[PDB]
Amino acid sequence: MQAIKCVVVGDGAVGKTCLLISYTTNAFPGEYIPTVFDNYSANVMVDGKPVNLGLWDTAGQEDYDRLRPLSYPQTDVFLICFSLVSPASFENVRAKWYPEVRHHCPNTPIILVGTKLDLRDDKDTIEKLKEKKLTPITYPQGLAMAKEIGAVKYLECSALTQRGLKTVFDEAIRAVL
Amino acid sequence: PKVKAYLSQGERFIKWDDETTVASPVILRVDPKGYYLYWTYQSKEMEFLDITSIRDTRFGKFAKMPKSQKLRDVFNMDFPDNSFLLKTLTVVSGPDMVDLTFHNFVSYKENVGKAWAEDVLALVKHPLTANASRSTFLDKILVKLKMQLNSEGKIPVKNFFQMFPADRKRVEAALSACHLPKGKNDAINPEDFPEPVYKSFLMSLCPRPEIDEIFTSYMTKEHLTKFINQKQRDQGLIDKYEPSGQLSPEGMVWFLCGPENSVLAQDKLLLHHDMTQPLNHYFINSSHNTYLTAGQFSGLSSAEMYRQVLLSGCRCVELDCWKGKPPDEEPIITHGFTMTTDIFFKEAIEAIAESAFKTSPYPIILSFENHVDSPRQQAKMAEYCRTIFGDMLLTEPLEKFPLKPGVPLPSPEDLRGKILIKNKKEESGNLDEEEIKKMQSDEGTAGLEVTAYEEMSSLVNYIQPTKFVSFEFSAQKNRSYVISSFTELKAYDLLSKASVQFVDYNKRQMSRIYPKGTRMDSSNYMPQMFWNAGCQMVALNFQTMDLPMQQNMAVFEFNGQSGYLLKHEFMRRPTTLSITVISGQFLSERSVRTYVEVELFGLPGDPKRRYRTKLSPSTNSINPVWKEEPFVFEKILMPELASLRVAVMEEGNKFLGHRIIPINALNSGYHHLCLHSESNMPLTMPALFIFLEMKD
Ligand SMILES: Nc1nc2c(ncn2[C@@H]2O[C@H](COP(=O)(O)OP(=O)(O)OP(O)(O)=S)[C@@H](O)[C@H]2O)c(=O)[nH]1
Ligand SMILES: [Ca+2]
Ligand SMILES: [Mg+2]
């Protein structure tokens, strides 16, 4: 029963927790509650082998900058997340998350995850973004960012529709074995 | 004592130094029944701490502070106006006053530590937490077994072997008898181990044939009625205890282990003594050379000792004060002319101010042995007391009680929450190697103190120490605010020459007894003799849990562990006991022969015969059964002043557990005597089955 420690990081509100809850319970959270720290598990079959997947949820709020890293020791794989409809969270992948993860775990595999895929083509969100002088992050951008931080994989998904969701965790597992 | 929901719900903290330099996120909780304080790491791994093992809780500035720079940074401690002090929590645990473990937690939220510290301590210090019935302790075992699961969410069979280590064979056979997997590397589904399956498992592992004999005398509701009125004296029970209007032997076992059948008159554990009598009319829990953690000549001194003794209700502590060297000129506390380490006088004051009234609201006496031959440092001493103790310090006599001849001392109530300083206010001088040479064996450094200057003198009122001259001299002066201190040797000598006057002296004034200088090993002297004479401050070395301290902790647990016990009215005004040691359960973690000793501590005219059980029939320690005749203590004159000692030892004399119980607090009948450690803390596994009978 091979165990794997997967830590999920990224700006606050990018959808990290919904990512974990939707994946482990196939249910989507009904109330947004900022995370301090949490843990979820899941036994999964990957390439014909049972794996005990430990999912470590972290705080996106910057008030936890010194405390957050306390969950990093012995991490097998990191999921750096950013919202596909939040250029700010995308920029922080390079300005904050990548450097923070590499500082504490220089050799640990990283998987870049673009979240809220369902909203990229959503009309309401776009108008809202246009009013904010913004626009969604495109796949080519995501892929390019992944190359820049040396991510083993770039993956987009939606916790809401679950499209691309399971793939994220299968790859996270395969990045370790 | 009910466990508040938020405690069981849990709170997020960062536990540090559980390793070194390692800070670990955890969710801290107290199970619904108040048995354990346990934290869960992100990896799901759990760590348990018995509520009964906790000695204190601290938050804010009183919490332990991290030293390593790494942790200092993690917690932003070197940051201007941070809020670290609003997040610190420290839980102190340990088998005694010295062997301590500090569990340090830092919360994410602000101000939650205070609630946790106060609520957890209230559970710990609740009299009924330590004095629950046998069934409660057996239940703590079950809760533990079912709470400590593996990754598969099951109970490892290995955990049963660790819980009941004396004989694996018998444990294996017990699991099998309950159709459960017997096998180093099996796990049991928790739903397969509920009550009464656990109960059946216990009955199989620990058969109770002696209880079957009680039946020889099922059991109808009528018989049970006869039993309770004849044996346990001076239908709902059957429904509650019978596993399946008849009571089976197993049902009898659980009933006898239940709360309705307590060996103690539990109301006695609560603060119920009349606290309005004069101070010298009470026995006062006292500590000698409090600052020492070991050894009188070699060993370390620690301000923490003050916290520990005070948290147990000690009301009289000692501070040996010595001058500090320049450039600081800071007074210190140590055992002069030895190799014991030093602590600053100031830290002792800070330790005392913190813990003084956490577990008892009644007055404390600070016995100063002053060797500070420096008016400036003595002024520093007085200053530290006034400023740190603040309003707690009694700086002047009470209006209703002037320091005049014929006036009695105030009562514990009149001095509630007050700290009294015992210091000189007569020969004085500095000690010499030679001067301590011929005192070392008796009075020690206490044999000579320096003169008290103005600053310190002003702080003394109701506890003025003067060298003893004679009982008639004392009676002549008629001053109730003067205290006389004697070594165990001097006090014993006085009892052999003037017992009548010593007894009368204690009705008017205070006498403090302390160990002879020859006890460099910090051993203690038996206190009974002195309490019998009315001596109120019988100071012992709290760091040494030998018999005298075993009895001291036991008797002062009563009256709400306030540290005060009202003397019998015959000591203030100006029955036959039989115990049969029947059997014992899980007495040792290993299979060894065991024996029990029973004796009485009381007045000179009380029964003095001592009893020792025959060795247990074999190395079976799970359920040994003895064949002893009743151990009798005839004509106990004053039950109030006497206590019964029941101690369990394994062959070879290693202490396993005991109970020392004042006679008036004992209930009669068949009982499951839950055993305590030397420091009087409740033990989970060991217990004795006994039969008590009181007659006039
Ligand atoms: N439309 C859509 N909304 C999503 C999706 N995933 C998350 N959200 C929404 O995003 C908001 C925040 O998501 P959440 O998972 O709580 O963020 P977080 O990163 O865990 O935030 P923190 O814990 O660092 S502060 C919630 O209101 C949630 O409903 C998604 O895939 N699609
Ligand atoms: Ca001394
Ligand atoms: Mg969240």
User: What are the residue numbers of the active site of B?
Assistant: 288, 335
Q: Quick one: fold of B270-574?
A: TIM Barrel (3.20.20)
Which 8-state DSSP code applies to residue B572? T
How are strands ordered across the β-sheet holding B643-650? Answer: B611-612, B594-601, B643-650, B654-662, B669-676, B682-695, B576-585, B631-633
CA dihedral angle for residue B486, residue B488, residue B489, residue B493, rounded to 10 degrees: 70
Whether B392 contacts B358, CB under 8 Å: no
Whether A85 contacts A94, CB under 8 Å: no
Assign residue B402 a region: left if phi > 0, alpha if psi is -120 to 50, beta otherwise? Answer: beta
Rounded CA-CA distance B527/B287 in Å is 12
Residues of B in contact with A70 (CB under 8 A): 14, 23-25, 74
Of A64, A77, A62, residue with least CA distance to A11 = A62
Q: Which ligand is nearest to the CA of A158?
A: 1
Query: What would the two tokens of residue B30 be?
Result: 């107290």
Q: Give B594-640 as a 3 state SS string.
A: EEEEEEEECCCCCCCCCEECCCCCCCCCCCCECCCCCEEECCCCCHH
One-letter amino acid identity for B1?
P
Give the residue carrying structure tokens 């390019």.
A144
CB of A2 less than 8 A from some CB of B: no
Distance A117 CA to ligand 1 centre (A): 12
Q: Which residues pair with B287 in a beta bridge?
A: B540
Q: Which residues pair with B638 in a beta bridge?
A: none
Rounded CA-CA distance B84/B250 in Å is 54
One-letter amino acid identity for B501?
Q
Rounded CA-CA distance B108/B97 in Å is 31
CA distance A37 to chain B (A): 8
Rounded CA-CA distance B368/B456 in Å is 10
Whether B445 contacts B369, CB under 8 Å: yes
What is the per-residue DSSP string for B410-423? PPTTTTTT-EEEE-
Whether B259 contacts B241, CB under 8 Å: no
Assign residue B76 a region: left if phi > 0, alpha if psi is -120 to 50, beta otherwise? Answer: left
Question: Is B383 known to sit in a ligand binding site?
Answer: no
Whether B50 contacts B103, CB under 8 Å: no
Rounded CA-CA distance B58/B91 in Å is 7
Distance A39 CA to ligand 3 centre (A): 12
Query: What would the two tokens of residue A119 be?
Result: 């909203």
One-letter amino acid identity for B177?
A
CB of A71 less than 8 A from some CB of B: yes
CATH 2.60.40.150 domain span(s) along chain B: 575-696
A58-to-A36, A69, A176, B424, B527 alpha-carbon distances in Å: 6, 9, 20, 62, 59
Note whether B25 contacts A66, CB cutoff 8 Å: no
Of B148, B69, B144, B71, residue with least CA distance to B104 = B71
Whether A39 contacts B44, CB under 8 Å: yes
Whether B688 contacts B581, CB under 8 Å: yes
Whether B181 contacts B172, CB under 8 Å: no
- By the 10 Å C-beta count (0-12 exposed, 13-18 middle, 19+ buried), B64 is classed as middle
**Using alpha carbons only, how large is chain A's radius of gyration in Å?**
15
Whether B577 contacts B637, CB under 8 Å: no
What is the DSSP pairing of strand A37-45 with strand A50-58? antiparallel
Residue nearest to atom 15 of ligand 1 (CA): A15
Handedness of CA B259, B264, B269, B275 (dihedral sign): positive
Which 8-state DSSP code applies to residue A97? I
Rounded CA-CA distance B371/A149 in Å is 70
Q: Which residues pair with B611 in a beta bridge?
A: B598
CATH, domain range B575-696: 2.60.40.150
Rounded CA-CA distance B72/B66 in Å is 6
Neighbours of A127 (CB within 10 A): 10
CA distance B42 to chain A (A): 6
Of B523, B60, B77, B96, residue with least CA distance to B304 = B96
The answer regarding whether domain A1-177 maps to CATH 3.40.50.300 reads yes
Phi, psi of B164, deg, nearest 5: -120, 75
Which 8-state DSSP code applies to residue B408? P
Give the residue carrying structure tokens 């562990």.
B561
Of B457, B69, B537, residue with least CA distance to B284 = B537
Of B270, B337, B356, B340, residue with least CA distance to B302 = B340
Whether residue A69 is preceded by a cis peptide bond, meaning omega within 30 degrees of 0, is: no
The CATH superfamily of B207-269 is EF-hand (1.10.238.10)
Distance A36 CA to ligand 3 centre (A): 8
Size of interface A-B (CB pairs under 8 A): 27
Query: What would the two tokens of residue B33 be?
Result: 């029944």
Ligand 1 pocket: which of A25, A32, A55, A57 to mutate (most atoms within 8 A of CB): A32
What is the DSSP pairing of strand B576-585 with strand B682-695? antiparallel
One-letter amino acid identity for B129?
T
Whether A105 contacts A78, CB under 8 Å: yes
Note whether A52 contacts B44, CB cutoff 8 Å: no
Rounded CA-CA distance B221/B595 in Å is 36
Q: Which residues pair with B612 in a beta bridge?
A: B597
Rounded CA-CA distance B347/B33 in Å is 37
Whether B554 contacts B680, CB under 8 Å: yes
Q: Which ligand is nearest to the CA of B319?
A: 2
Per-domain boundaries in chain A:
1-177
Whether residue B327 is preceded by a cis peptide bond, meaning omega within 30 degrees of 0, is: yes
Q: Which residues contact B301 (CB under 8 A, 6 or more apart)?
A: B291, B292, B293, B333, B334, B335, B340, B341, B342, B343
Rounded CA-CA distance B70/B75 in Å is 9
Rounded CA-CA distance B378/B375 in Å is 5
Rounded CA-CA distance B371/B337 in Å is 12
What is the DSSP pairing of strand B54-59 with strand B88-93? antiparallel
Mutate which of A1, A4, A5, A37 to disrupt the B interface (most B C-beta within 10 Å)? Answer: A37
Rounded CA-CA distance B300/B289 in Å is 12
Rounded CA-CA distance A113/B254 in Å is 59
- What's the angle, vertex CA B497, arms to CA B496 and CA B498, rounded to 5? 105
B19-to-B15, B16, B23, B106 alpha-carbon distances in Å: 9, 7, 8, 15
Phi, psi of B581, deg, nearest 5: -85, 105
Q: Which residues pair with A1 in a beta bridge?
A: none
**Using alpha carbons only, how large is chain B's radius of gyration in Å?**
27
CATH 3.20.20.190 domain span(s) along chain B: 270-574
Distance B464 CA to ligand 2 centre (A): 16
Q: Which residues contact B81 (CB under 8 A, 6 or more apart)?
A: none
CATH, domain range B1-206: 2.30.29.240
Query: Taking an 8 Å Cβ-Cβ cutoff, which residues of chain B contact chain A?
Result: 12, 14, 23-25, 42-44, 73-76, 108, 151
Residue numbers preceding breaks in chain B (C to N > 2.5 A)? 217, 234, 244, 425, 574
Question: Ligand 1: does its nearest atom lie under 6 Å from the Cβ of A68?
Answer: no
Helices B134-147 and B197-205 cross at an angle (nearest 10°) of 110
Question: To what resolution in angstroms was this structure determined?
Answer: 2.2
Question: Ligand 1: does its nearest atom lie under 6 Å from the Cβ of A37?
Answer: no
Rounded CA-CA distance B350/B388 in Å is 7
CA atoms within 13 A on the CB side of B217: 11
Tell me the residue length of chain B: 696
Residues of A in contact with B23 (CB under 8 A): 70
Whether residue B331 is preceded by a cis peptide bond, meaning omega within 30 degrees of 0, is: no
Whether A141 contacts A134, CB under 8 Å: no
Query: What would the two tokens of residue B178 be?
Result: 């309950």
Distance B526 CA to ligand 2 centre (A): 19
Q: Which residues pair with B465 in a beta bridge?
A: B483
CB of A12 less than 8 A from some CB of B: no
B356-to-A41, B316, B363, B444, B463 alpha-carbon distances in Å: 48, 10, 9, 27, 18
Rounded CA-CA distance B631/B597 in Å is 10
Rounded CA-CA distance B591/B164 in Å is 11
Cα B110 vs. chain centroid, distance in angstroms?
33
Q: Which residues contact B127 (CB under 8 A, 6 or more apart)?
A: B266, B269, B270, B560, B561
Residue nearest to atom 32 of ligand 1 (CA): A116
Rounded CA-CA distance B613/B631 in Å is 9
Residues of B in contact with A39 (CB under 8 A): 42, 44
Note whether A39 contacts B151, CB cutoff 8 Å: no
Whether A59 contacts A12, CB under 8 Å: yes
Phi, psi of B314, deg, nearest 5: -60, 140
Q: Which residues of A are annotated as a binding site?
A: 12-18, 31-32, 34-35, 59-60, 116, 118-119, 158-160
Residue nearest to atom 6 of ligand 1 (CA): A15
The H or E element that residue B201 is part of is helix B197-205
One-letter amino acid identity for B542?
F
Whether B532 contacts B641, CB under 8 Å: yes
The H or E element that residue B309 is part of is helix B304-311
Which 8-state DSSP code applies to residue B409? P
- What's the angle, vertex CA B114, arms to CA B108 and CA B117, rounded to 5? 105
Q: Which of B14, B43, B151 sits opposite A70 (nearest CB)?
A: B14
